[PDB]
C-alpha cells in the first residue's frame, strides 16, 4: 500500500524532459496497455507532453498530459481517460530512467512506474534500477515488464 521514499530526493527542473519508455510497472499493466512511449516538454517546473500507447482492441492512441510539479510529487493528468490520474511521488531519478509511485483509479492500492530513456536498456542501467527499487521497499520481483517490445534485459 506504500513504499519508503528517500528522506527527500525532491526533484530537479527540466529533469523529466525528453522521451521515455514505460516498460516496467508493479502491478503489471501490460495486458491492458503496451508500447508506452512518452515525450515531455518542460514549461518551467511543469511539463506538457504526449503518451503514445497501443491497446489490444484499438490502435496506436496518443494522450495529452500535463504534470504539475510540486516538490517530490506531481499531479499527472491526461486529457482523455482520467484513469491513471493521481499525485505521484518521485521515487528515483537518473540519466536514463526515473521511477514514480502513486495510487491512480487503475491501481488505488498503489502503482509504481519505471520510465526509461531507451526502449531496451543495457544491464548496467537495470542494476541501478534494481538498487533504487530496494532503496524504497520494492523489487524487480513484483515488477512486470512489457514483453510486447522484446528486450532480453527485461526478462
Ligand atoms: C511502438 O510505437 C512506435 C512508434 O513509431 C513504432 O515504431 C512501433 O512499431 C510500435 N509498435 C507497436 C504499435 O506495438
Ligand atoms: C493540468 O490540467 C488540469 C486539467 O483540469 C488543470 O486543472 C491544471 O491546471 C493543468 N496544469 C497545467 C496547465 O500545467
Ligand atoms: C522483469 O525483468 C526483470 C529483469 O530486468 C526480472 O528480474 C523480472 O522478474 C521481470 N518480471 C517479469 C514478471 O517479467
Ligand atoms: Zn501512497
Ligand atoms: Zn491509452
Ligand atoms: Zn528474450
Residue numbers in the entry: 1 to 155
Per the authors:
Diploptera punctata, also known as the Pacific beetle cockroach, is a viviparous cockroach that gives birth to live offspring and secretes a highly concentrated mixture of glycosylated proteins as a source of nourishment for developing embryos. The principal component of this milk is lipocalin-like proteins or Lili-Mips. Lili-Mip has a lipocalin fold and binds to different fatty acids and other moieties. Lili-Mip is small (18.8 kDa), monomeric, and glycosylated.
The structure of Lili-Mip2 showed that in the ligand-binding pocket, Glu-38 is held in position by hydrogen bonds from His-115 and Tyr-40, enabling ligand binding. We hypothesized that the kink formed by E38 in Lili-Mips results in a preference for the binding of unsaturated fatty acids, with the unsaturated bond occupying the position at the kink. The mutation of Glu-38 to alanine was predicted to influence ligand binding. Mutation to alanine only slightly altered the positions of Tyr-40 and His-115. Mass spectrometry analysis showed that all Lili-Mip isoforms (and Lili-Mip2-E38A) bound abundantly to palmitoleic acid (16:1), palmitic acid (16:0), oleic acid (18:1), and stearic acid (18:0). Lili-Mip2-E38A did not exhibit fluorescence intensity change on ligand binding. Therefore, we could not measure ligand binding affinity even though mass spectrometry analysis showed fatty acid binding. The crystal structure of Lili-Mip2-E38A suggested that the binding cavity did not extend to tryptophan. In the bound fatty acid in the structure, the distance between the terminal methyl group of the acyl chain of the fatty acid and the ring of the Trp is 8.4 Å, compared to 3.8 Å in Lili-Mip 2. We propose that binding of the fatty acid at that distance will not significantly change the tryptophan environment resulting in a change in intrinsic tryptophan fluorescence.
